[PDB]
Structure formats: structure tokens, C-alpha cells
Design a protein around this ligand. Structure first.
Ligand SMILES: [Mg+2]
Length: 243
């Protein structure tokens, strides 16, 4: 999409007051981008919330993809009960959800993910993982030598999660990058919102059940239809980004 890429790039540069994107880093969301883990996460959240007397559908779990467990629990609690959940409730729910997910731990790699990461690493770029998930052994086994511990952001690295820009800002800080030196690769509306709020060129890759518009409406600079789509377009995109 050569000319489409330039339009997105130039719009981003104009609205932020940059001369160019000087690409050094690519910040990947984990769930639904690196691993096809969302079906399990959505079902686990739905089932565990039901066990605790709360109604969270699989689809609403997708809408809340990236959000801290506490914020998700509190959204549902406030609306059903008119108050936030207690610390005790939140800890119990998260524990049950963790255990439930682990009944089926091994999410597949997303097709196209290992291939695109290898191209990015080959080019001298720094891949990073940014996740609201609470795994480097699992990452190592699936993406060998791609990611580094000092270059990852997880639920325990940061106070506020998506859609707060904090996870992505922490990624730039950890990696020593400026916002115009990175790309965010996201698959969920709250993830897209966080990347856009962090002022980094944000690419949506729709790997789930939601409409493209859900991602576009959060200000994604570009959208691909799948991780293989993203992978196939990497060469053209990196070229478009080089001034
Ligand atoms: Mg995700």
C-alpha cells in the first residue's frame, strides 16, 4: 500500500510536528498479536466472572482487551452493584481466572508473527513486548532470541494499563526511544487508544471478532486485516517510513 502508507505517515508527522519517523523500535502487543491467546482469555474471563456472580460476555472481554483485571472487574461491579469490588474480591477473581486460563496454557503463535519479528531483528531494529498481561521463557521458546527482559513491559512494570498510554511510554523510556522512532502494533481498541495517546505511530491488526471500525475509531494510523497481512507488507512499510 505504498501511497496509502505515505498518507498515514505524513498525517502523523504533520499532527505531531515531526520531520520524519526514524525507525529504531517496534513495540508489539502480546495477546492477539504474538500469540493467539484471546479466545482462551475471553472464555476464562467470561466463565470466572460468571462464577463470582458477574455478567461479562466473551465479546465484552474482547472490548476490555488490555485493561487491568481490576479495572475490568470494577466496571462490571459498578454497573451491577453500584460500587467497586473489594481488594479481596479482585484478588480472588484474578487468581481463579489465571488458573482457568492455565487449563489450556499453550496459545499458538500468530501466523506471520515469527516471520515479521525475524525481519525486524535482521534490520537492526529493536523489538519490544508491551502487555497488560500478568512468560519470557514462553516468549523465548516461540520467538528465539527476539525479545529482551530489559526491553519488555508487563502488568507488573506499570501502575496504569491500557487505554492509559503508560505501558507504551514505559516502553519508550526503557528502550531509550523517542515517539517518532517507534511503531505500536496493536489488535484491540483500548490498546490502539493507548498507543495513539502515547503519540507513537499506531498500527492496528484486526485478529479478533470485532469490526475494523472499533480499531479505526481509536485513531489507528494504519490497519491490517491479519498478522500475515502485516508481515507481507513489512518491507513496503519500512521503505515508506525511511525518509
Ligand atoms: Mg491484544
Amino acid at each position: 500500500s505504498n501511497a496509502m502508507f505515505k498518507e498515514a505517515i505524513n498525517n502523523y508527522l504533520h499532527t505531531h510536528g515531526y520531520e520524519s519517523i526514524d525507525l529504531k523500535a517496534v513495540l508489539f502487543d502480546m495477546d492477539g498479536v504474538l500469540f493467539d491467546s484471546m479466545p482462551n482469555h475471553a472464555e476464562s474471563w467470561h466463565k470466572i466472572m460468571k462464577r463470582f456472580g458477574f455478567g461479562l460476555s466473551r465479546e465484552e472481554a474482547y472490548m476490555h482487551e488490555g485493561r487491568t483485571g481490576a479495572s475490568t472487574i470494577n466496571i462490571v461491579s459498578r454497573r451491577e452493584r453500584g460500587h467497586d469490588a473489594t481488594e479481596e474480591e479482585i484478588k480472588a477473581i484474578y487468581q481463579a481466572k489465571t488458573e482457568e486460563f492455565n487449563k489450556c496454557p499453550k496459545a499458538e503463535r500468530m501466523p506471520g508473527a515469527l516471520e515479521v519479528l525475524t525481519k525486524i531483528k535482521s534490520e537492526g531494529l529493536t523489538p519490544m513486548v508491551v502487555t497488560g498481561s500478568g512468560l519470557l521463557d514462553r516468549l523465548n521458546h516461540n520467538f528465539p532470541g527476539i525479545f529482551q527482559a530489559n526491553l519488555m513491559v508487563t502488568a507488573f512494570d506499570v501502575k496504569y494499563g491500557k487505554p492509559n498510554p503508560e505501558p507504551y511510554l514505559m516502553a519508550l523510556k526503557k528502550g531509550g526511544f523517542k515517539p517518532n522512532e517507534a511503531l505500536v502494533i496493536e489488535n484491540a481498541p483500548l490498546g490502539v487508544q493507548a498507543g495513539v495517546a502515547a503519540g507513537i505511530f499506531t498500527i492496528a491488526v484486526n485478529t479478533g471478532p470485532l469490526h475494523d471500525n472499533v480499531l479505526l475509531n481509536e485513531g489507528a494510523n494504519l490497519l491490517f486485516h491479519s498478522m500475515p497481512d502485516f508481515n507481507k507488507n513489512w518491507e513496503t512499510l519500512q521503505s515508506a517510513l525511511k525518509q
